[PDB]
């Protein structure tokens, strides 16, 4: 509406655009690592609810699609283990969960696509290795789109700013001219 | 066909098997159940000069100490190190 208001929004959406881009780049590297680790994890995999996701949002419909234990801080806050997702999952993570004790996880397909004794720890591990590959791809995807949406909003807001900037000057001048005439 | 993998590495996509129980595989495995192992390694990477140090350290905590099932964890570590 007013130049000061747009000024603050513009600085805000400019920062977001940059952060979303950097977050896309971190997730791209995290996915690159995860997809490499998923290869030997699948061949190993071949041979109560409770719900598998992570602590971190900004990954689209990863948490919502999978949503009394739940691995991931998002699972319990929406509906217990914390500190998952940030560091790639290990078999030790699966053991911790199994020791504290269907299985609901996001299965990796591609960068865009994903779908919802000792072998007990194997199944938890399988779900973990698939989940993070899906989560890192989905975050990379969502942040790419967010950074694009931020870009288009920066342009739209900059145009509104400049039309308002010009209109303010023109209006002030017309009031001055009218008073003088 | 025969499949042999750890959660991180694939080795194969007669097999001598220790029963799992820490020991040598001839086509070193830690444990597990296609042969599935929590840690499967060479054989080139293992030392072995430090496993003796690990065995003696585990036998030091055994003469602790004391409280049951602590203890049982120490003995398992002694069994893995002896192999």
């Amino acid at each position: 509406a007013t130049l000061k208001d747009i000024t603050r929004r513009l600085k805000s959406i400019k920062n977001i655009q940059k952060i979303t881009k950097s977050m896309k780049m971190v997730a791209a590297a995290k996915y690159a690592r995860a997809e490499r680790e998923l290869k030997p994890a699948r061949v190993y995999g071949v041979g109560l609810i409770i719900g598998v996701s992570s602590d971190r949002g900004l990954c689209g419909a990863i948490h919502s699609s999978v949503a009394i234990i739940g691995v991931g801080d998002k699972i319990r806050s929406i509906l217990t283990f914390k500190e998952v997702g940030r560091r790639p999952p290990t078999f030790g993570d699966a053991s911790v969960i199994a020791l504290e004790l269907s299985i609901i996880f996001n299965r990796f397909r591609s960068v865009i696509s994903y779908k919802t004794e000792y072998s007990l720890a194997n199944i938890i591990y399988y779900s973990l290795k698939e989940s993070t590959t899906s989560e890192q791809s989905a975050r990379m995807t969502a942040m790419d789109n967010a950074s694009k949406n931020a870009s288009e909003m920066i342009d739209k807001l900059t145009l509104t700013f400049n039309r308002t900037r010009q209109a303010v000057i023109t209006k002030e001048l017309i009031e001055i001219i009218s008073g003088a005439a | 066909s025969f499949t042999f993998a750890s959660p991180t590495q694939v080795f194969f996509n007669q097999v001598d098997v220790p029963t799992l129980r820490p020991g040598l595989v001839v086509v070193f495995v830690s444990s597990g159940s296609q042969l599935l192992a929590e840690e499967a390694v060479t054989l080139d990477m293992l030392d072995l000069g430090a496993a003796k140090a690990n065995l003696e350290k585990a036998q030091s905590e055994l003469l602790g100490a004391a409280d049951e099932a602590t203890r049982a964890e120490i003995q398992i570590r002694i069994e893995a190190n002896e192999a």
């Binding site: 053991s95 020791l99 | 820490p22 072995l48 690990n54």
Partner: peptide, 25 residues
Amino acid sequence: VAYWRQAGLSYIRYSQICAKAVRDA
């Protein structure tokens, strides 16, 4: 019955200890 399975314990803890002992060597 195995000694570790008396007061406790699971085979998951067994494997967890054995796997770590391999890494530490």
